[PDB]
């Protein structure tokens, strides 16, 4: 019997949360993916060469049941931000504090990802900074880009489920 590891992806709206999960399940890339489904994905992933089932949930929207439950029995978080916007990054600490509330703890498995940094040209938020609320929330942190050619898309969920492993 695997493991099934129940992972939620949280952050502001248009920072990459479905383009991000759309990569790691279906390992395309959809631009402009519709803002507003938000929906759960079930695949058998190997990490470490130990087989495991994912339930991702791509978070988006006020109140939903869906949303309400996978932040409850979730056992770890992506809170994703863009580095072209710098309000995704100020709300990385808001969901910091939703997460630890919803589970009612003083910490929980993260990781801290920054997405579309392919658009150096348009970067706002620096890897000095991202380190810096990293270190401070104490979770990982990561760069990722689901624009093709992806990076670190599949390293963003597979270090999740290893700090969830390593506790
Ligand atoms: N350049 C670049 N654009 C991205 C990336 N990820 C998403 N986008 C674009 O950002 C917009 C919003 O992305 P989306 O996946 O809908 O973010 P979400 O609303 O949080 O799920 C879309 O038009 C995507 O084409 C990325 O890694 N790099
Ligand atoms: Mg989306």
Do not use: C
Not at 124 to 145: C, D, F, L, V, W
Request: no cysteine; net charge negative.
């Amino acid at each position: 019997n695997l493991p099934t590891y129940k992972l939620v992806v949280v952050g502001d709206g248009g920072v990459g949360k479905s383009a991000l999960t759309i990569q790691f399940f279906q390992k395309i890339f959809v631009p402009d993916y519709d803002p507003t489904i938000e929906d759960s994905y079930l695949k058998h992933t190997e990490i470490d060469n130990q087989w495991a089932i994912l339930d991702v949930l791509d978070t988006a929207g006020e109140f939903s049941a869906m949303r309400e439950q996978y932040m409850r029995t979730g056992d770890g978080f992506l809170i994703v931000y863009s580095v072209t916007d710098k309000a995704s990054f100020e709300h990385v600490d808001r969901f910091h504090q939703l997460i630890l509330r919803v589970k009612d703890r003083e910490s929980f498995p993260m990781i801290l990802v920054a997405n579309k940094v392919d658009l150096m040209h348009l970067r706002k938020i620096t890897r000095e900074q991202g380190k810096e609320m990293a270190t401070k929330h104490n979770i990982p942190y990561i760069e990722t880009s689901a624009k093709d050619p992806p990076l670190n898309v599949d390293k963003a969920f597979h270090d999740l489920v290893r700090v969830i492993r390593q506790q």
